[PDB]
Amino acid sequence: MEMEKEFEQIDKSGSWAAIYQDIRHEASDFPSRVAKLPKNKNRNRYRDVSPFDHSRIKLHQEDNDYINASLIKMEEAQRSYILTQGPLPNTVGHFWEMVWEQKSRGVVMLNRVMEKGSLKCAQYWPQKEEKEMIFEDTNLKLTLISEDIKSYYTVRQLELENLTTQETREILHFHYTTWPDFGVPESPASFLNFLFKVRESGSLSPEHGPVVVHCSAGIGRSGTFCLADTCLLLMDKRKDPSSVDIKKVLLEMRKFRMGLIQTADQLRFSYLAVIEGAKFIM
Numbered sequence: 001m002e003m004e005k006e007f008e009q010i011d012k013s014g015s016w017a018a019i020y021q022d023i024r025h026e027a028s029d030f031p032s033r034v035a036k037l038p039k040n041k042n043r044n045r046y047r048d049v050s051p052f053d054h055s056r057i058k059l060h061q062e063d064n065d066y067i068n069a070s071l072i073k074m075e076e077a078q079r080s081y082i083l084t085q086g087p088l089p090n091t092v093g094h095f096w097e098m099v100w101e102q103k104s105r106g107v108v109m110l111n112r113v114m115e116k117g118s119l120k121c122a123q124y125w126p127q128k129e130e131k132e133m134i135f136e137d138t139n140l141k142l143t144l145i146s147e148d149i150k151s152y153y154t155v156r157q158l159e160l161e162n163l164t165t166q167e168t169r170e171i172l173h174f175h176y177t178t179w180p181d182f183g184v185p186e187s188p189a190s191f192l193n194f195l196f197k198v199r200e201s202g203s204l205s206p207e208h209g210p211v212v213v214h215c216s217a218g219i220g221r222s223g224t225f226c227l228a229d230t231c232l233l234l235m236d237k238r239k240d241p242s243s244v245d246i247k248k249v250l251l252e253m254r255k256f257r258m259g260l261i262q263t264a265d266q267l268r269f270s271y272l273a274v275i276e277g278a279k280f281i282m
């Protein structure tokens with residue numbers, strides 16, 4: 001079926017939970033043996049969210065190459081994304097090592113450091129120009145260059161220096177600050193405006209490594225971001241945009257990382273974002 005009318009048909013019939021459970025039943029199951037090794041327990045935020053072995057990002061390190069991060073490679077859309085968890089106190093150095101080694105231009109953050117009164121990720125970037133951060137375990141230095149605070153999101157320019165070689169790079173930090181503590185946003189308008197800002201920066205483009213995107217677990221909000229981007233791109237590329245099937249795209253992405261889209265409300269919100277976004281493109 002088309003998307004917008006499949007949408008109204010699920011709303012009128014109140015069957016979002018049944019649609020979402022079908023997706024969960026059909027999703028791929030692949031091994032995640034490296035994630036579950038005992039030496040990696042303090043590298044995982046949640047015991048039930050793990051990268052698959054076949055698509056995990058490897059750190060260029062001979063001691064321990066593990067990070068909770070996955071490469072989502074979308075062949076028809078010609079986009080790639082790295083989806084990862086919010087860094088932990090003992091993985092902030094690994095996170096920036098991955099950014100460096102994969103040649104990413106942008107980092108997309110979809111959570112606040114504290115939500116619901118608890119810490120959802122480490123404070124992994126500097127908050128003041130004159131107070132830079134040094135990660136001694138991976139030999140990197142990170143400096144805040146500038147910061148632009150808007151009503152729904154903040155963009156920061158950061159300098160990352162590899163202290164071994166003295167090479168430096170400019171990394172853009174796109175921080176969506178207004179996703180609610182419970183549920184999903186009422187309108188997709190600000191989320192779409194945020195997506196378009198990330199796109200306009202060059203951070204999603206083939207001349208760079210894959211964008212790094214995260215929330216707390218790296219599957220819910222993060223899944224919504226890459227699912228919406230990929231579906232809108234396919235609607236531009238194809239002769240028949242109504243052929244884009246959002247459930248099929250989601251199942252394809254779930255071949256690369258488990259659990260993408262965590263609730264039936266997130267699934268509905270993803271539909272809403274693609275539907276509204278397709279009207280603005282034209």
Ligand SMILES: O=C(c1ccc2c(c1)OCO2)N1CCCCCC1
Pocket residue numbers: 103104105168169170171209
């Ligand atoms: O700092 C970088 C840069 C960033 C990330 C990279 C990279 C280069 O190579 C590998 O990953 N640029 C490149 C162009 C955009 C702005 C100017 C400077």
